[PDB]
Design a protein around this ligand. Sequence first.
Ligand SMILES: OC[C@H]1O[C@H](O)[C@H](O)[C@@H](O)[C@H]1O
Ligand SMILES: [Ca+2]
Length: 760
Amino acid sequence: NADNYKNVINRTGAPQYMKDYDYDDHQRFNPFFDLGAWHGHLLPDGPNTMGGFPGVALLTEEYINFMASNFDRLTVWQDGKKVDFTLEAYSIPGALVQKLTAKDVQVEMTLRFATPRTSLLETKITSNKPLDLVWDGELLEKLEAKEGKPLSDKTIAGEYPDYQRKISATRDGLKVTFGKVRATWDLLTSGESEYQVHKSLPVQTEINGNRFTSKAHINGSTTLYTTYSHLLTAQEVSKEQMQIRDILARPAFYLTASQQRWEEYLKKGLTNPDATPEQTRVAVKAIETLNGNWRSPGGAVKFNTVTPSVTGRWFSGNQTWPWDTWKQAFAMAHFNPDIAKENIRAVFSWQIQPGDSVRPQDVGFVPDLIAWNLSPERGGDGGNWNERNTKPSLAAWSVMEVYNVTQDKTWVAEMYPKLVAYHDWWLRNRDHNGNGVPEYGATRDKAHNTESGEMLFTVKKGDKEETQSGLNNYARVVEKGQYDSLEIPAQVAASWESGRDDAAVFGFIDKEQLDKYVANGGKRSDWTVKFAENRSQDGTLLGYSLLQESVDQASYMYSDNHYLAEMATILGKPEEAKRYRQLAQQLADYINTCMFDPTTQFYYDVRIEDKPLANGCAGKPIVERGKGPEGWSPLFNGAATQANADAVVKVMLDPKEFNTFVPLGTAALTNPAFGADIYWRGRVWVDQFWFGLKGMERYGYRDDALKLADTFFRHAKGLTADGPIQENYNPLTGAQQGAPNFSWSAAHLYMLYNDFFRKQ
Ligand SMILES: OC[C@H]1O[C@H](O)[C@H](O)[C@@H](O)[C@H]1O
Ligand SMILES: [Ca+2]
């Protein structure tokens, strides 16, 4: 099956910089990674890379960095003369292949992954006469470029004097050793990491600084085997040696293992017979993308996980977020369920337990960002690890999907208490007014407050910065309004927790947009989101909340309650199931009564006003900040009444609202803060789009949902091309932006393939 999908993504490239970046700082080539390995490979594109797989990409704990352009490139010689080959090179799901053809000699090279640290190259050589073989390689010297043009003349050695890269011959090949570099935002190594090459035949190696040449002589047709291993600790180095020996001992077994695993991914995953060839290839792109972004256990993360992008500036290593994980595992349930399960475990593996040394007041909390290196507060030197906030919860929905496929009740039994702990955490620490409807917010944190628990903030006016603390001073300053801006680190983290950091609904709007809003009759203060601290009975600071209840978050809580009810029933916990059923019903009633505007016939967030409404709602729908994708969150999540869903579907299909060139973007055309190129105020994301389609389907509009899917398929740029998957689309032009090889989009493109794409 794999052979039907050659070059689904362009995996060619010959990088010349460690940071061979695109416009947005992401590695501009798309290397092949598999088995959760910590290195990857590209295809040759021409005579200068022919005979090897260039662009060895190392995952240095939390980042992707290229090591070399050519490394272990084969040239062949027969009687003192170099054999001139022609090249055919291609990817398939699970392998890179290149075929070299000359008259008297042919070579077939197949590169697959054998372990979580090691790839295996088969070099199959056909020749009726003896040959001399030569392998060469060279470490990169130059640091950084953008769009192929250097940003500076900085060198790698120059930038990182302790990196101390050295190539050494071994008893069975060679190795590259690396010094300890703790460059928190660029390059992380242990001082014990290595890149090892082991081969099945004796070789003779000459080393010349950062280049090498290796030689061997063979007597005729022969198949050689070479392992490539990026090993990040002393203990990884030690443990891998017996694996590498087994691989060179049983190479066919490892090749077959990979072939079969990939046939299984494709068999299990490609289950929409109505889909066209083009549509199915999109699903294969998503499968290759997701599987490449999977990482084995590494550092503090003791489970397999999946990151938003192995090639991403800030998304590589094993950096893992919960929001991304829910959708990732939802999709991967349908083709790589074992890793879907692991990914969810990874996220809950650092869930806060009672007695936690940093935040005992956050039991059940799930960190925003986990990674190889713990933060200084937990004993590591990691800059990325984040516990300032979490992300919106579709955890139960994610877990349930894994169950739907596997029917594995032991999986439900495992996750249920962890899901319940997160649930209970939301209700304790993100419910400022105590009404059972959550807010987006932030934790108590060194970045957010003093040691005594006084919320930090910085008032700005012209060029004067005034840094104060305490919720007393914040209220006193908000009223006056004699500031250009008010920076509240805890409110920044609340925007991160919402998952949509410049959204209209959360008060984000540009200067010219606001002027027009005011000229049309509104007030500037309509766009001010107020902020509050959350405390327990005894006065313990639990964290913070936006003084605003979000309709998407409420709907996700409805989801959580609905799916916990089903899990409780599966597990034979009827009384707990009944409680969640009632909580679900309570949220649905609140969402429908409080958040659905009778007048505009659409859903919106509500403010937590100074006093609740007579009907018990926290405040009125925030109609004036305009319509967004949160308005269909109740449909996707199943909270809406039929009447309210019918109304919302009318708006979604309205070409003056959301039925744009690429439909269902992150702000209606009528939104006062709309911008086609703004991430969370116009741009179309595949998750929010798919939530829309599912929401429509649930309330009887599958036919219209299938039409929108067709429109997406015809209008979203690059979909049928061989480019890597990115983050979002301009709703007017269809133009793509964001990180290449983006898991979240791949997840929902896969879902669209399964649920809505079809032959017209
Ligand atoms: O560093 C944490 C940070 O990472 C990325 O920037 C995300 O987009 C934010 O929401 C936040 O999680
Ligand atoms: Ca509340």
